[PDB]
Design a protein around this ligand. Structure first.
Ligand code: SO3
Lengths: 107, 53, 92
DNA sequence: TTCATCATGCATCTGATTGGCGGGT
DNA sequence: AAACCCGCCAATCAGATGCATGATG
């Protein structure tokens, strides 16, 4: 049950919880109205489906969790129990999936 | 080295964020003056923790 | 359109981070802010891709499958395919 | 024509925002 | 040593949610 071991099985657990636990499609960790406001921030975006922020609510939950666990691995390796910004910056550089954040988290 | 799948969309977003900085031209220590005041005004324990009236 | 409409609330982001870490763990305020900025761009980045596809196809509504298609196109196939299972449940 | 589903405005009320201190980093 | 800084607490009120309406395709 090491940090790298829970990251290795991460998507196995995500899919298990998706397939088993009975979801609440109103109650989320993130508010749907703010997700929609972020989408509406783009001038090109016109109308948004009710389903879209709901997908982003779960997607962003998975995203924050995955990146936090990646950043935590870098914190453990420096024997710190406080997660720093540099731990997140280190995690982004380990996968090209995070290249879209190049301008958000420089260096 | 750039994610070929994300290259076009990254530069589309960079231009889009540049417009939005130009438009929103005007982070802060606090967002709201009313909530800042509430917290400052509020009674605290000796430890600095907020408490009930 | 307010200027804080771009970002999700920091407390909600910080709670998800807290749940992802061991009970004893601490999170720097810059790490909370950095994560808030990252996850907000995640939404904007994907939504922009879905948005432009809807424009070329003369559709006004950015719908659920447009988000999944965009996620696959941009290399979030794990997110696209996981949320496809989640979507079929919601519709069920 | 009808149906499914969007934005908008409004009422209700809820949880995000908030900072001084101490002890762990 | 000695800076540095994040979890702890709960009340106000910015805003999230949910419903009615009209628009849209
Ligand atoms: O090289 S980055 O700017 O796509």
């Amino acid at each position: 049950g090491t940090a790298r071991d829970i990251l290795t099985t991460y998507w196995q657990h995500i899919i298990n919880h998706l397939e088993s636990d009975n979801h609440d499609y109103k109650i989320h960790q993130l508010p749907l109205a703010r997700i929609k406001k972020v989408m509406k921030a783009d001038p090109e975006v016109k109308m948004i489906s009710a389903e879209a922020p709901i997908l982003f609510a779960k997607g962003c939950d998975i995203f924050i969790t995955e990146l936090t666990m990646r950043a935590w691995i870098h914190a453990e390796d420096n024997k710190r129990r406080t997660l720093q910004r540099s731990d997140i910056a280190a995690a982004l550089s380990k996968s090209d999936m995070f290249d879209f954040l190049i301008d958000i988290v420089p260096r | 080295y750039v994610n070929a799948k994300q290259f076009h969309r990254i530069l589309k977003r960079r231009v889009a964020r540049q417009k939005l900085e130009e438009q929103l031209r005007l982070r802060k220590p606090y967002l709201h003056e009313s909530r800042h005041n509430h917290a400052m005004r509020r009674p605290r324990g000796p430890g600095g923790r907020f408490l009930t009236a | 359109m307010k200027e804080q409409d771009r970002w999700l609330p920091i407390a909600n982001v910080a709670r998800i981070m807290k749940l992802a870490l061991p009970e004893n763990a601490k999170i720097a305020k810059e790490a909370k802010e950095c994560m808030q900025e990252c996850v907000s761009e995640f939404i904007s980045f994907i939504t922009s891709e879905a948005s432009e596809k809807c424009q070329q196809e003369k559709r006004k509504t950015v719908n659920g499958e447009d988000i999944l298609f965009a996620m696959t196109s941009l290399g979030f196939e794990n997110y696209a395919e996981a949320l496809k299972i989640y979507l079929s449940k919601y519709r069920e």
